[PDB]
PDB file of C-alpha atoms and ligand atoms in Angstrom:
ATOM      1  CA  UNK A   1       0.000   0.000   0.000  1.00  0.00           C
ATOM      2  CA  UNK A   2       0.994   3.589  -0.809  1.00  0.00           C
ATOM      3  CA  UNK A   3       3.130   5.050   2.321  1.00  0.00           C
ATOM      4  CA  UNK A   4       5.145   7.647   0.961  1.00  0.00           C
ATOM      5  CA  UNK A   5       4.779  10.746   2.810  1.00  0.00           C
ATOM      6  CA  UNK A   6       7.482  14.179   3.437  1.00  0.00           C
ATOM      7  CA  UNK A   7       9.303  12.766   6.474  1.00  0.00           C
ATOM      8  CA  UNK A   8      13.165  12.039   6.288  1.00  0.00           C
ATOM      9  CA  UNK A   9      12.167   8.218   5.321  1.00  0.00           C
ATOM     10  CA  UNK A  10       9.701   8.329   3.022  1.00  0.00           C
ATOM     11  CA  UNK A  11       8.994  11.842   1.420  1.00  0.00           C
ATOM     12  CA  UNK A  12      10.472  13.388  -2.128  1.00  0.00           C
ATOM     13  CA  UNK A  13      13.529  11.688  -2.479  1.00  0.00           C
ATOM     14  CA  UNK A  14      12.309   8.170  -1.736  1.00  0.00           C
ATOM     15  CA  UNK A  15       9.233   8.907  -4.071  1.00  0.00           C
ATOM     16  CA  UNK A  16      10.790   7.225  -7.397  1.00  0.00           C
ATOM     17  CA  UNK A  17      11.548   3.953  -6.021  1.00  0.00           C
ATOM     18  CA  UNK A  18       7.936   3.339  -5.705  1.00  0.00           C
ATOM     19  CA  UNK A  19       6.729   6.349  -8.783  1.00  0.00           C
ATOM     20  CA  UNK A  20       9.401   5.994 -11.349  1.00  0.00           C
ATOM     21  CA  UNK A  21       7.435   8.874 -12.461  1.00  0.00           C
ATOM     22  CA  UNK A  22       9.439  10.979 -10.042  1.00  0.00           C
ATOM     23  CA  UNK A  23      12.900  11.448 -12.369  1.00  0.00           C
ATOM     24  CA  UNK A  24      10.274  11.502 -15.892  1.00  0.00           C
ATOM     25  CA  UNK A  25      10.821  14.833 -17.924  1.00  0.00           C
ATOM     26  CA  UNK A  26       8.072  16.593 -17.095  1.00  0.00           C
ATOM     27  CA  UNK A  27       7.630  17.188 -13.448  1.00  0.00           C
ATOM     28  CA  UNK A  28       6.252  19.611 -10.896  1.00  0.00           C
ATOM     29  CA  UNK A  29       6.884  22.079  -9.180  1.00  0.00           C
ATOM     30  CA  UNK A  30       9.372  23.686 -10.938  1.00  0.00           C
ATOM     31  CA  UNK A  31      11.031  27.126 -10.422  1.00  0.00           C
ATOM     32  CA  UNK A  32       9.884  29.975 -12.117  1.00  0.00           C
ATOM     33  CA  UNK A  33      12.926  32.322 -13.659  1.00  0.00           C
ATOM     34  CA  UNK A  34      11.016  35.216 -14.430  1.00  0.00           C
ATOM     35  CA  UNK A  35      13.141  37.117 -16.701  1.00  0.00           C
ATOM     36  CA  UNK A  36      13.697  33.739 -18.891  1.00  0.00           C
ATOM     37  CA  UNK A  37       9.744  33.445 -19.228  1.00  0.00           C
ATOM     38  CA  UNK A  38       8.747  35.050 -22.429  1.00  0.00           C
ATOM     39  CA  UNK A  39       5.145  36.595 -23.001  1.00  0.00           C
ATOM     40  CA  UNK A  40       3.067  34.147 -25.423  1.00  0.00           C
ATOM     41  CA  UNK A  41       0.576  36.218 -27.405  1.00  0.00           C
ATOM     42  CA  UNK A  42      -0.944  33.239 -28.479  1.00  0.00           C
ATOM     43  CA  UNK A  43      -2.528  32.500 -25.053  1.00  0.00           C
ATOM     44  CA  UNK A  44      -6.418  33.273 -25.206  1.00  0.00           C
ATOM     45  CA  UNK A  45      -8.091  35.216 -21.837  1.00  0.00           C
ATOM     46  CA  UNK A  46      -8.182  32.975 -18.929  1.00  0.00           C
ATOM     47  CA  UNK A  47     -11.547  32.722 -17.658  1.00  0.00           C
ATOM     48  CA  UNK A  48     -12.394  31.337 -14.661  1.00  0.00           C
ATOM     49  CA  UNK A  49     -15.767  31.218 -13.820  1.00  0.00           C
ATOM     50  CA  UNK A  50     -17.349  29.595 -10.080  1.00  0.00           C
ATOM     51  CA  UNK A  51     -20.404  31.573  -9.560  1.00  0.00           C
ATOM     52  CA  UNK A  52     -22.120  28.472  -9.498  1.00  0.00           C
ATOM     53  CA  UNK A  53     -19.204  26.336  -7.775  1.00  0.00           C
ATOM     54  CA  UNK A  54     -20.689  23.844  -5.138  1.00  0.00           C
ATOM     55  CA  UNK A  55     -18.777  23.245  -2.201  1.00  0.00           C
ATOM     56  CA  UNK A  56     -19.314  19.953  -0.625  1.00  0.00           C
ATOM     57  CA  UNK A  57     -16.803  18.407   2.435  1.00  0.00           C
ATOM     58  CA  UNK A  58     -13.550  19.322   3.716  1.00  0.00           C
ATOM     59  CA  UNK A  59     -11.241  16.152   3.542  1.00  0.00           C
ATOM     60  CA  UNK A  60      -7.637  15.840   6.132  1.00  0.00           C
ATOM     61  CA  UNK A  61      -5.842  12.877   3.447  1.00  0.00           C
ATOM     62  CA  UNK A  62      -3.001  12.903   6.269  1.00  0.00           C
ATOM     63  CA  UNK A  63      -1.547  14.940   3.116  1.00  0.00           C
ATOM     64  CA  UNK A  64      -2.982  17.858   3.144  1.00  0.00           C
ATOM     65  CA  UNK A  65      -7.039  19.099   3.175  1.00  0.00           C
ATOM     66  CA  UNK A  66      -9.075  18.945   0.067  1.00  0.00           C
ATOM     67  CA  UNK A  67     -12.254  20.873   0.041  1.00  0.00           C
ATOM     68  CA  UNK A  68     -14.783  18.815  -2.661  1.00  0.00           C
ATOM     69  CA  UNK A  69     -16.705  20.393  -4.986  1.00  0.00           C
ATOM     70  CA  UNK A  70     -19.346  18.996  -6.798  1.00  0.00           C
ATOM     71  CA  UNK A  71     -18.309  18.156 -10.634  1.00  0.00           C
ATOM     72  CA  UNK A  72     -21.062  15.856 -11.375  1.00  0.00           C
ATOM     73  CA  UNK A  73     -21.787  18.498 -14.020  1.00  0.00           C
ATOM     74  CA  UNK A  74     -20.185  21.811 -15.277  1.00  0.00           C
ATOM     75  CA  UNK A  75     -21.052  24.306 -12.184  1.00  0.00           C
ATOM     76  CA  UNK A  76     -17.275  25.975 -11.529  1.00  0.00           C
ATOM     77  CA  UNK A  77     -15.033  25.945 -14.562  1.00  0.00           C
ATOM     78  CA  UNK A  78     -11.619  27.056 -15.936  1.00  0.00           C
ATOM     79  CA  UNK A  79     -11.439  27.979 -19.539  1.00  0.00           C
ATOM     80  CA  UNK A  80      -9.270  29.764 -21.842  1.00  0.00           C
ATOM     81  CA  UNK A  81      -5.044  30.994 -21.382  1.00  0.00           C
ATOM     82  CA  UNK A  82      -3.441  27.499 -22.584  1.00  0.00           C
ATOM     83  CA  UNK A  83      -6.241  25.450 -22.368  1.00  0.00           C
ATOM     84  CA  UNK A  84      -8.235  23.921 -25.051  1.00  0.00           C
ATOM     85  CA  UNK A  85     -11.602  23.052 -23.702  1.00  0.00           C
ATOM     86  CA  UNK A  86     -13.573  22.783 -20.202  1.00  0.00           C
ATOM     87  CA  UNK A  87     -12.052  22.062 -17.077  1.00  0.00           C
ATOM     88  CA  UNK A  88     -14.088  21.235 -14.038  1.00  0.00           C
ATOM     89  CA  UNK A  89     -13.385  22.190 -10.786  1.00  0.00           C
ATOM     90  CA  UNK A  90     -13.396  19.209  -8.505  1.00  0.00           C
ATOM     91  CA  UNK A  91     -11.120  20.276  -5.274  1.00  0.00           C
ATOM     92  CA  UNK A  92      -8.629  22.698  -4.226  1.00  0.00           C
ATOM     93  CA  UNK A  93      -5.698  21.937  -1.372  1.00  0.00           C
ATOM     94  CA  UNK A  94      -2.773  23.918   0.290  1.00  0.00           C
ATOM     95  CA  UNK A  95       1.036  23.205   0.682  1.00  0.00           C
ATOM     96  CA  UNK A  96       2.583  25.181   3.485  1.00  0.00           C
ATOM     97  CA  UNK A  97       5.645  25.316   5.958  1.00  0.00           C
ATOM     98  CA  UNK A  98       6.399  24.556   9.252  1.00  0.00           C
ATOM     99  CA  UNK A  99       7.783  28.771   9.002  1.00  0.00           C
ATOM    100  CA  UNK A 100       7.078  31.365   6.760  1.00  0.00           C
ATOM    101  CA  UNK A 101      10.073  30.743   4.551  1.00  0.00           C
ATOM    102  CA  UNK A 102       8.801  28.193   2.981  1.00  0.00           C
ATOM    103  CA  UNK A 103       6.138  25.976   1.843  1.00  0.00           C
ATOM    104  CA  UNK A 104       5.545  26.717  -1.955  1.00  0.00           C
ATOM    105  CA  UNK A 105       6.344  24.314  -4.229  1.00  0.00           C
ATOM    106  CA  UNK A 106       6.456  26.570  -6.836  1.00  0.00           C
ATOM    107  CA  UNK A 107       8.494  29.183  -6.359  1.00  0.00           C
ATOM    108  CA  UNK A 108       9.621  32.081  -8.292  1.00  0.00           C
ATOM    109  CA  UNK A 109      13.246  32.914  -8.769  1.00  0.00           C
ATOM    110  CA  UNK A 110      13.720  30.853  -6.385  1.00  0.00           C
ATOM    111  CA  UNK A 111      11.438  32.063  -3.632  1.00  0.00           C
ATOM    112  CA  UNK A 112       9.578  30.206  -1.713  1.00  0.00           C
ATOM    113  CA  UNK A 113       6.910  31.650  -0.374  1.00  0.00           C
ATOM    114  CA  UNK A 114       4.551  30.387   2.910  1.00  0.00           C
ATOM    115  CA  UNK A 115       2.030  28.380   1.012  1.00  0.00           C
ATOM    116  CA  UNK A 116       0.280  27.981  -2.235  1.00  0.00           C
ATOM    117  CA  UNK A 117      -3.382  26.890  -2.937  1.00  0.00           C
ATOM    118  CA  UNK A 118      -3.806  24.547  -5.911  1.00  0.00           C
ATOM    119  CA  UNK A 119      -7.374  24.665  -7.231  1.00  0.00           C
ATOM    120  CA  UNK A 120      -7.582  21.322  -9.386  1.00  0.00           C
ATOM    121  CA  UNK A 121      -9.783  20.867 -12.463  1.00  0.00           C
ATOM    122  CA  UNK A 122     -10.114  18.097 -14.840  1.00  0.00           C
ATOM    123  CA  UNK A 123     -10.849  18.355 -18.731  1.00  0.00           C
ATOM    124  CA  UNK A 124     -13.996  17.107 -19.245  1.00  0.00           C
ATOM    125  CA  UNK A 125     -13.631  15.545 -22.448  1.00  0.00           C
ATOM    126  CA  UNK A 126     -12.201  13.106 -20.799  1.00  0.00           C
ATOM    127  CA  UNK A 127     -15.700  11.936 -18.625  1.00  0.00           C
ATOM    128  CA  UNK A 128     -14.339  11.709 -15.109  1.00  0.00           C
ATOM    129  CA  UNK A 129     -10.780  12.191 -13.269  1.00  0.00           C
ATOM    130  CA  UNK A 130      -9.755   9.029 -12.989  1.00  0.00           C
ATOM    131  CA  UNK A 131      -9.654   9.156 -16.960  1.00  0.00           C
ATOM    132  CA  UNK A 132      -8.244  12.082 -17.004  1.00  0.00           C
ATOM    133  CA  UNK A 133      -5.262  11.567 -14.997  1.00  0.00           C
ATOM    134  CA  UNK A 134      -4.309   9.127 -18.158  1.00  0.00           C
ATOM    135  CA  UNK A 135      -4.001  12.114 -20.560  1.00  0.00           C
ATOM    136  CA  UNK A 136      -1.513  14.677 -20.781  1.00  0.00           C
ATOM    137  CA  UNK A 137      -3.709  17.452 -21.078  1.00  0.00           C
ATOM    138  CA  UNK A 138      -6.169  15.464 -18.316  1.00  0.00           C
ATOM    139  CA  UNK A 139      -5.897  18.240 -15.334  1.00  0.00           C
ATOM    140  CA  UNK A 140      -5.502  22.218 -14.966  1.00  0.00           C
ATOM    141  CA  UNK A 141      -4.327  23.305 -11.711  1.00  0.00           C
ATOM    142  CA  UNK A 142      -4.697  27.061 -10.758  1.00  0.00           C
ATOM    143  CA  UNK A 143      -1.529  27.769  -8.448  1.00  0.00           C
ATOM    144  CA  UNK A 144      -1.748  30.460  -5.758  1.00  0.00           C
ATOM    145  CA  UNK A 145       0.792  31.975  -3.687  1.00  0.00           C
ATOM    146  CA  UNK A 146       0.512  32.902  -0.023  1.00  0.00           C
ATOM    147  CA  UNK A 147       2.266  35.183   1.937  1.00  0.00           C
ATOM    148  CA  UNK A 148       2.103  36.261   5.205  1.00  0.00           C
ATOM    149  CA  UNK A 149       0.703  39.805   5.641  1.00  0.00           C
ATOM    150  CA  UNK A 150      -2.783  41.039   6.005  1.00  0.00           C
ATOM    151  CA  UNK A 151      -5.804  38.273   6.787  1.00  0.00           C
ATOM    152  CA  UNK A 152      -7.617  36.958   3.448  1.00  0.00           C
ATOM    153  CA  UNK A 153     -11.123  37.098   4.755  1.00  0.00           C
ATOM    154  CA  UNK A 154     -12.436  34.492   2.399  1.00  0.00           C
ATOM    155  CA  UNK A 155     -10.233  31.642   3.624  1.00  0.00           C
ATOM    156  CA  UNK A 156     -11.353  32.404   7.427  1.00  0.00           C
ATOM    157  CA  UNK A 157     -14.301  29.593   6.260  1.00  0.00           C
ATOM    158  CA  UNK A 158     -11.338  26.739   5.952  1.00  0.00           C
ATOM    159  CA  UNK A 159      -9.095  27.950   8.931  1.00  0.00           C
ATOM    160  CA  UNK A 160     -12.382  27.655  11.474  1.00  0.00           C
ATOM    161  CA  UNK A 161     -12.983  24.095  10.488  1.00  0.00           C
ATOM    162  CA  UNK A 162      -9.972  22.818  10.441  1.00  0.00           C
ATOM    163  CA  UNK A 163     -10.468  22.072  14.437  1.00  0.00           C
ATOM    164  CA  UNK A 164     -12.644  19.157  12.920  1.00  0.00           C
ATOM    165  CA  UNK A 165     -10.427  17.671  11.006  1.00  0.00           C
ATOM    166  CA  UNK A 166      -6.980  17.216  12.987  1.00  0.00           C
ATOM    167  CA  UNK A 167      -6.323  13.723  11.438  1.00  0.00           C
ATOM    168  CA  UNK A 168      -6.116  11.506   8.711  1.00  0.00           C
ATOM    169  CA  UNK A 169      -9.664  10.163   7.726  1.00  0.00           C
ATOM    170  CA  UNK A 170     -11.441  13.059   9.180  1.00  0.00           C
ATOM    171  CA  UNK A 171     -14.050  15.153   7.397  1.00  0.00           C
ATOM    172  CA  UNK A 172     -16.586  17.992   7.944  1.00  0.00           C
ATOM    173  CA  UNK A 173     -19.198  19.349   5.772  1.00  0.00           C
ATOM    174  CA  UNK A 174     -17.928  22.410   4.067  1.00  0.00           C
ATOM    175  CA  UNK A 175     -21.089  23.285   1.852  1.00  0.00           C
ATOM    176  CA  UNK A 176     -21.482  27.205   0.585  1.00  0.00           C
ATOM    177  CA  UNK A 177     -18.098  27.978   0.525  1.00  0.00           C
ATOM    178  CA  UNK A 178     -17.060  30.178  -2.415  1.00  0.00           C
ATOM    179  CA  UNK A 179     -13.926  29.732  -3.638  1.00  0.00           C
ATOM    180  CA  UNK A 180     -13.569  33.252  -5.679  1.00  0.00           C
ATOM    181  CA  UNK A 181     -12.909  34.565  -2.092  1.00  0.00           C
ATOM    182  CA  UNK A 182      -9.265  33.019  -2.676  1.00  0.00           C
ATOM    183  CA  UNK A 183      -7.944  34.640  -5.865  1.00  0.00           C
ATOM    184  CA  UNK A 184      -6.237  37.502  -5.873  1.00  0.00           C
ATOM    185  CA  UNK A 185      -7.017  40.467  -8.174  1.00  0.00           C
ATOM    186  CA  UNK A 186      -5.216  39.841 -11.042  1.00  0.00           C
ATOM    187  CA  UNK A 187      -5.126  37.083 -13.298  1.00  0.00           C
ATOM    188  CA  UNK A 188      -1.927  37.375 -14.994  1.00  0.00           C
ATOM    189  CA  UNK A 189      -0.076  34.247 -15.024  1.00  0.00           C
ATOM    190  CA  UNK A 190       3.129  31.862 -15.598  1.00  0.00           C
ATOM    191  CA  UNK A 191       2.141  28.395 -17.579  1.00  0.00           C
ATOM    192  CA  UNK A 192       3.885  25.072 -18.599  1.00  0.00           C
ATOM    193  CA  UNK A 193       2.842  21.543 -19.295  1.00  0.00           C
ATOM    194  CA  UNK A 194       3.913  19.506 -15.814  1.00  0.00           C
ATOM    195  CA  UNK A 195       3.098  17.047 -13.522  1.00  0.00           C
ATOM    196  CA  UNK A 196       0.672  15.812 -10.266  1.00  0.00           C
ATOM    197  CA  UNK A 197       3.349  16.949  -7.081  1.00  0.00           C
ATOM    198  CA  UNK A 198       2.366  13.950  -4.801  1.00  0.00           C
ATOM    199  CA  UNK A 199       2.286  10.162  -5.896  1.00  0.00           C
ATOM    200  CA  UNK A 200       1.339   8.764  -8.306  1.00  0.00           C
ATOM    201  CA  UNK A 201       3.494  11.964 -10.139  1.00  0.00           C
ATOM    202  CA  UNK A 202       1.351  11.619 -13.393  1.00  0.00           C
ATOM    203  CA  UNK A 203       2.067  13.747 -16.070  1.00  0.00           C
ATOM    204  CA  UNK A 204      -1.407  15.201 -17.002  1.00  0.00           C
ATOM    205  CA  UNK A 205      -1.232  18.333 -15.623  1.00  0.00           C
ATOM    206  CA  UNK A 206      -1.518  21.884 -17.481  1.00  0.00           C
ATOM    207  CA  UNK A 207       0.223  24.562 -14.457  1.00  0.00           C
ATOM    208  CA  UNK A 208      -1.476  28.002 -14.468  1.00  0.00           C
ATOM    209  CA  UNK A 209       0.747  30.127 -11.732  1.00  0.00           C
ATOM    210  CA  UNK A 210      -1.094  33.344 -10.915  1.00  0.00           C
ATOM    211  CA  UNK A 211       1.285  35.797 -10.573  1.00  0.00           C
ATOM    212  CA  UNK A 212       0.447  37.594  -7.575  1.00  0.00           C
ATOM    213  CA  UNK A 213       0.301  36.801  -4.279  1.00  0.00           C
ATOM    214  CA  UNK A 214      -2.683  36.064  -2.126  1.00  0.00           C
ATOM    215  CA  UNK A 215      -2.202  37.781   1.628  1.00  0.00           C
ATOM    216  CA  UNK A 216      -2.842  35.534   4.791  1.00  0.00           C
ATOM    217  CA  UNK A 217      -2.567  36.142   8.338  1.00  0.00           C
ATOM    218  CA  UNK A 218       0.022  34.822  10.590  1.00  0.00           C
ATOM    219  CA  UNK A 219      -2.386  32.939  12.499  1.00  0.00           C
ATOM    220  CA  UNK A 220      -4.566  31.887   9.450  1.00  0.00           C
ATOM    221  CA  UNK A 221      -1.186  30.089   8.295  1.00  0.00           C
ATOM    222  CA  UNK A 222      -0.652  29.160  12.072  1.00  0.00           C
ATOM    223  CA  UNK A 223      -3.583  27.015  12.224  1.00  0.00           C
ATOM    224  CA  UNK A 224      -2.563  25.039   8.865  1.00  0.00           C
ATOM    225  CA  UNK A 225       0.374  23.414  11.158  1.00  0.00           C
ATOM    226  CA  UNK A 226      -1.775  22.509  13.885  1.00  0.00           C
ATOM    227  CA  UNK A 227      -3.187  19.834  11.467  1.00  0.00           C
ATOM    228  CA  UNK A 228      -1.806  16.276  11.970  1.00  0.00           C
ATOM    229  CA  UNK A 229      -0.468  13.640   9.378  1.00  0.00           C
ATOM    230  CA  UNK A 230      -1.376  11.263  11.385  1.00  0.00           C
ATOM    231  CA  UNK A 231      -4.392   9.482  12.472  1.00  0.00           C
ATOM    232  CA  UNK A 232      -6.747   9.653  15.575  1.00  0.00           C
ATOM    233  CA  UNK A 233      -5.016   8.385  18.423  1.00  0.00           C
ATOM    234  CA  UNK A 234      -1.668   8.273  16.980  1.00  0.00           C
ATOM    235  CA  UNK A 235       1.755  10.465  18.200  1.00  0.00           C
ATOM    236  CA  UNK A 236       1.069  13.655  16.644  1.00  0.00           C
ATOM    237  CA  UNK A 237       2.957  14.579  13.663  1.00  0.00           C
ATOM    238  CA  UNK A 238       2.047  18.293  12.256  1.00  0.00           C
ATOM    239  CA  UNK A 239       1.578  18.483   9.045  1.00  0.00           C
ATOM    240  CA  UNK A 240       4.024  21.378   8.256  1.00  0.00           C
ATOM    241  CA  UNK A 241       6.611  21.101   4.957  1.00  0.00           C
ATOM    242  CA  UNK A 242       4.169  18.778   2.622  1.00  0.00           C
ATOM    243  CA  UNK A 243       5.303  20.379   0.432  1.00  0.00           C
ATOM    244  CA  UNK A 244       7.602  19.006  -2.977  1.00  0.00           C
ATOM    245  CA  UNK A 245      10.782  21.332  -4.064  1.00  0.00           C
ATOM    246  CA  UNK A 246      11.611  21.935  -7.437  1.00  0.00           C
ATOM    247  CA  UNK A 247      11.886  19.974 -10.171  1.00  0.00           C
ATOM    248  CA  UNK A 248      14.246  19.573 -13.073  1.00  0.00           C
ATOM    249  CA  UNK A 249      12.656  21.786 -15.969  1.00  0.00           C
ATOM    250  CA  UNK A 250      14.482  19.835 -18.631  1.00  0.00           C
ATOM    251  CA  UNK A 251      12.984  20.415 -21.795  1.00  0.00           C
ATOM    252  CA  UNK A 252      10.383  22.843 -21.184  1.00  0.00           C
ATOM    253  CA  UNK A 253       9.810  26.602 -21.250  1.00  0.00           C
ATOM    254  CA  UNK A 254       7.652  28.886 -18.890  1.00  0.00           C
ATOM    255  CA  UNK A 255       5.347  31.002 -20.706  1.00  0.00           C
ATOM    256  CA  UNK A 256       3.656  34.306 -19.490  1.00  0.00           C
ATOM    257  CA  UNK A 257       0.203  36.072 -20.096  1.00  0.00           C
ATOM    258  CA  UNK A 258       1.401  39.593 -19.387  1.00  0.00           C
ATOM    259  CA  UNK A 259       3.840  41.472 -21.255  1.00  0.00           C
TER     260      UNK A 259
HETATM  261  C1  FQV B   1       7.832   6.729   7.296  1.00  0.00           C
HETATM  262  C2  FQV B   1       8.385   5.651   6.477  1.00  0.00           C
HETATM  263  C3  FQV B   1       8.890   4.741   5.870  1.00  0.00           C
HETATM  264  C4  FQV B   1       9.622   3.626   5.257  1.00  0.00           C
HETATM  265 SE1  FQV B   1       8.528   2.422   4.225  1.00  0.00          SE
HETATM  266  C5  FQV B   1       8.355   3.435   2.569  1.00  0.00           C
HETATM  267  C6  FQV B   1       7.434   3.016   1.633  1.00  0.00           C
HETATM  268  C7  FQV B   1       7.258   3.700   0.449  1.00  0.00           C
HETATM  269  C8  FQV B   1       8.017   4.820   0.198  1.00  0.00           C
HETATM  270  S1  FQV B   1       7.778   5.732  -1.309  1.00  0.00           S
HETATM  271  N1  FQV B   1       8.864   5.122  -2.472  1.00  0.00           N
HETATM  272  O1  FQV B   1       6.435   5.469  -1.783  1.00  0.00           O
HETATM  273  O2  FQV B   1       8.149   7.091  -0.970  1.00  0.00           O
HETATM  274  C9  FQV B   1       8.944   5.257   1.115  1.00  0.00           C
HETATM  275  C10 FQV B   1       9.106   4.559   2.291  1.00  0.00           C
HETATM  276  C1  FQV B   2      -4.608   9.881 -10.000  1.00  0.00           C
HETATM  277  C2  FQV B   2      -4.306  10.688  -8.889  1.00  0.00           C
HETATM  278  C3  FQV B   2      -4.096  11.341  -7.897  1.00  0.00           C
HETATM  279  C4  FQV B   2      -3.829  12.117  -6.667  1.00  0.00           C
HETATM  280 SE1  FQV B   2      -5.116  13.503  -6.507  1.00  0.00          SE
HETATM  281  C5  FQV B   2      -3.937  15.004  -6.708  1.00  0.00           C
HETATM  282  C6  FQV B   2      -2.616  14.971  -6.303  1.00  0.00           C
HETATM  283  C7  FQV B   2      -1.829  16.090  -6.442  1.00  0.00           C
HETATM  284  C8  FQV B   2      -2.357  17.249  -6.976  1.00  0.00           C
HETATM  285  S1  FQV B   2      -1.395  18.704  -7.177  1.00  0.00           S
HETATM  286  N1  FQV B   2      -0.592  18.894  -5.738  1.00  0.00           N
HETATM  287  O1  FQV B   2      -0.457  18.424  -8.255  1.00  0.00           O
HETATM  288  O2  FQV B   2      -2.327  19.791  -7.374  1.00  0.00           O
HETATM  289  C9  FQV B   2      -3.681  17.254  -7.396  1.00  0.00           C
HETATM  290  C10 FQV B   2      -4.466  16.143  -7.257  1.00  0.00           C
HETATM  291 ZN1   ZN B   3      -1.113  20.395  -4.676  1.00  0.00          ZN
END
């Protein structure tokens, strides 16, 4: 059964003797050299578009914490920039630190910053995710950064219930949460063709990288690491650093919507 984690003894550097995957030529994250990413004029407007974006349960995967959506039909969507096609929404998840220095996976010029939100969407001429994973145009993930600064009001929602979910296995309902209270005002963005960050390390995965920053609190981020990897009833381990570092970009180039 599948036991890699981001401890010393099973986390990104043990991941390829179980995901060959790991060493393939298209993996994520990667690092971001912003002066060597040129502006593509051949990238449509991005359109992202979750007024109708259903909310369901708030999952600890002794991971990270997925919030579900509903994608049982086309309610919050990505369209547009790279991508050919319709995208649906099915969950979005953090990486973070155990300090402020770090967390990203991405990072930019090689920054890290405290955490980034990855809202994950699946193409849906493919019929469901599990299908989707197979192609290499199967996912879009929306990166976000996070920094420490200012509270973002709109993830206040997550950080209250994450009390209820400490462990591994644990859930809450999350219903009526709006996700567009996570973005940050502009849309401009870094893309390349990459791959999932955690096992199984599939290679499906289109990267949009917003640009700027989202702004969290120091205790928003704070309550992130008071999550556990670990199970009920088990020695706590925080889950702090799940995060993967940077990948070899081998034969791939960075593109940017803004000039
Ligand atoms: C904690 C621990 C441990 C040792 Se057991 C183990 C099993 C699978 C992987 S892998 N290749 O999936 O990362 C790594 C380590
Ligand atoms: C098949 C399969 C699977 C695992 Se589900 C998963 C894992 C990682 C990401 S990530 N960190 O690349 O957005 C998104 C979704
Ligand atoms: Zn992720």
């Amino acid at each position: 059964s599948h036991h890699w984690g981001y401890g010393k003894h099973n986390g990104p550097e043990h991941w390829h003797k179980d995901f060959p995957i790991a060493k393939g030529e298209r993996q994520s994250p990667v690092d971001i050299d912003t002066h060597t990413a040129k502006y593509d004029p051949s990238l449509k407007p991005l359109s992202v578009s979750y007024d109708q974006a259903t909310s369901l349960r708030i999952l600890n995967n002794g991971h990270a914490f997925n919030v579900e959506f509903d994608d049982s039909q086309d309610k919050a969507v990505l369209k547009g920039g790279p991508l050919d096609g319709t995208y649906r929404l099915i969950q979005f998840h953090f990486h973070w630190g155990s300090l402020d220095g770090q967390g990203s996976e991405h990072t930019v010029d090689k920054k890290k910053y405290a955490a980034e939100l990855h809202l994950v969407h699946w193409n849906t001429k493919y019929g469901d995710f599990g299908k989707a994973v197979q192609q290499p145009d199967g996912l879009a993930v929306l990166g976000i950064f996070l920094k420490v600064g200012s509270a973002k009001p709109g993830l206040q929602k997550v950080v209250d219930v994450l009390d209820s979910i400490k462990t591994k296995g644990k859930s809450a309902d999350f219903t009526n949460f709006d996700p567009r209270g996570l973005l940050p005002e502009s849309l401009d963005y870094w893309t390349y063709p990459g791959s999932l960050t955690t096992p199984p390390l599939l290679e499906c995965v289109t990267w949009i990288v917003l640009k700027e920053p989202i702004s969290v609190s120091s205790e928003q981020v704070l309550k992130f690491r008071k999550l556990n990897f670990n199970g009920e009833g088990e020695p706590e381990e925080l889950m702090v650093d799940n995060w993967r570092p940077a990948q070899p970009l081998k034969n791939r180039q960075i593109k940017a919507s803004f000039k």
